[PDB]
Amino acid sequence: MVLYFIGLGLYDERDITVKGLEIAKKCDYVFAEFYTSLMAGTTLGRIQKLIGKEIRVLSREDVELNFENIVLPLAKENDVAFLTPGDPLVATTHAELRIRAKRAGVESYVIHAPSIYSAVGITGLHIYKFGKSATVAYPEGNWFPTSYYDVIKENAERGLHTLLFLDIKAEKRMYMTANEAMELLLKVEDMKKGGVFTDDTLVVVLARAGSLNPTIRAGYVKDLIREDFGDPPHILIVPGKLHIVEAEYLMEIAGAPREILRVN
Amino acid sequence: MVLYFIGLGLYDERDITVKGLEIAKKCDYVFAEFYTSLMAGTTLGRIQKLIGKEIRVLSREDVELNFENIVLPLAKENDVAFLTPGDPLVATTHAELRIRAKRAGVESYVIHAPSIYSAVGITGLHIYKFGKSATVAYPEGNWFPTSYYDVIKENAERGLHTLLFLDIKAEKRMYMTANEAMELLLKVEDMKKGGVFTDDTLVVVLARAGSLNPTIRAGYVKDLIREDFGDPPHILIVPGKLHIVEAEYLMEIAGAPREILRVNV
Ligand SMILES: Nc1ncnc2c1ncn2[C@@H]1O[C@H](CSCC[C@H](N)C(=O)O)[C@@H](O)[C@H]1O
Ligand code: NA
């Protein structure tokens, strides 16, 4: 008679917490969505095998328009689990689903999992120094999103790092690469000319966090724009003012150029 | 012949990931530290029982001063694990530990787990709206730090939420409760009078994140400052202007007063 929102983690089926696994295995029905992010190191089959249940995957429309018609009805008479990549509530609108659950008289519980939001720690950038985050969205038709550019500007003025979630078109199997994000940002700069993102801007790329060998690279846009960072998912980060120890990590672990040491 | 930084997660022994547990079980030596934070929903004994290996606890000095003499040497001929509450490398100084490993010729890998940085999502506050984070520290002697108050001011001014970690003295096991944090912030407000943190400020308190039964409470300082949020540690958040959906979540899930719909949105 309850609903569990359970995160599956960053890259593969084993990124689920022990808590999440033991609970999922005992749920009567298991639902999931894989449109909010990409778990590049696993498959629906491997996940089902792990928890030993058949998983009904839902589309964004199924969730946003019919969560209360598809999932909640079963939660009224059974224990139901709703799985999501990473942490279920981070950079999604799933939190709102708990309100729906309540209205339907269904108690809900959240089981966290490693999220890209904290995995940024592996870039060596102090996590407390990150400011407002944003998402680089694919332009659509004549509509060209640019608010994310202003976020970078605002954080940079404060010396804070900016985390940029990258766009995803799950149904089209399209996952935005850090390269595509950089290209878009350069075009926005050419339009706004705020000196926010140029060929000389230091950026950090984190690809496939959660995997054993994620790609962690740092350097100037002019040098990374055409670099191959491997398969998606990717996140792009625009550091603010660096502490010496952050720069040292970027240099020795992420291959950044020695010049970034002159933080002042 | 490798070092694994493995996160223990949020609250109890089941907050480690399947990957983290399986790797820890394959390591010849397993170390851990609980000075950055504690695992309040479990005990060292339960964690050791789960992993099935003796766990050697290291002090702040053992780590900061002698990581290369205690942990790294063993990675030359063995697989070693270094367990930390939350997600590895989140604590400010831990990333440098990877640099030490590399400089010492030791390959290292990071196995992630849930962190409070992402788990605060359960407050219903949009993660992208969080700005710079800070820690509320106790004043000592002739030193009265107030930077955390300025962080709140700068974030709120830009419509951003502020995640506030509360002072902790692991060894002594002395915690600053959310109540104590509010009292301190009010004192700072009286000093700077910037209109940043007052009796009318809306705040959110999160305790025992990770547990199946966390305490999530939202309301004005005047009403929550003397409320009992249960056992520490507590996390304090000062939201910036709210999206109506965030407000509705705080009301339905965190018991916030309906007044926030007309005052903080
Ligand atoms: N393992 C990973 N490596 C790199 N980027 C990742 C990632 N997982 C998610 N992302 C980034 O975040 C975007 C999804 S946003 C949803 C995030 C998810 N709830 C979480 O907690 O992680 C992706 O398009 C990508 O830009
Ligand atoms: Na943050």
Curated annotation (Swiss-Prot), chain A:
Relate the assembly described in the record. Answer: Homodimer.
Gene3D superfamilies in the record: Cobalt-precorrin-4 Transmethylase, Domain 1, Methyltransferase, Cobalt-precorrin-4 Transmethylase, Domain 2
GO terms (molecular function) for this protein are:
diphthine synthase activity
Q: In which pathway does it act?
A: Protein modification; peptidyl-diphthamide biosynthesis
* Miscellaneous field: The diphthine intermediate is not stable in vitro and readily eliminates the trimethylamino group. It is not known whether the elimination reaction also occurs physiologically.
Q: Which family does it belong to?
A: Belongs to the diphthine synthase family.
Which purpose does this protein serve, as stated in its record? S-adenosyl-L-methionine-dependent methyltransferase that catalyzes the trimethylation of the amino group of the modified target histidine residue in translation elongation factor 2 (EF-2), to form an intermediate called diphthine. The three successive methylation reactions represent the second step of diphthamide biosynthesis.
Q: Name one GO biological process term.
A: protein histidyl modification to diphthamide
The protein's matches in InterPro entries, at most eight in alphabetical order, are given as: 4pyrrol_Mease, 4pyrrol_Methylase_sf, 4pyrrole_Mease_sub1, 4pyrrole_Mease_sub2, Dphthn_synthase
Protein's UniProt name: Diphthine synthase
- Top-level division of the source organism's lineage: Archaea
- Protein EC: 2.1.1.98
Q: PANTHER family attached here?
A: DIPHTHINE METHYL ESTER SYNTHASE, DIPHTHINE SYNTHASE
This protein's UniProt keywords: Methyltransferase, S-adenosyl-L-methionine, Transferase
Its UniProt entry gives the catalysed reaction(s) as: 2-[(3S)-amino-3-carboxypropyl]-L-histidyl-[translation elongation factor 2] + 3 S-adenosyl-L-methionine = diphthine-[translation elongation factor 2] + 3 S-adenosyl-L-homocysteine + 3 H(+)
Q: Which residues bind S-adenosyl-L-methionine?
A: L10, D87, V90, S115, I116, L166, A209, H234
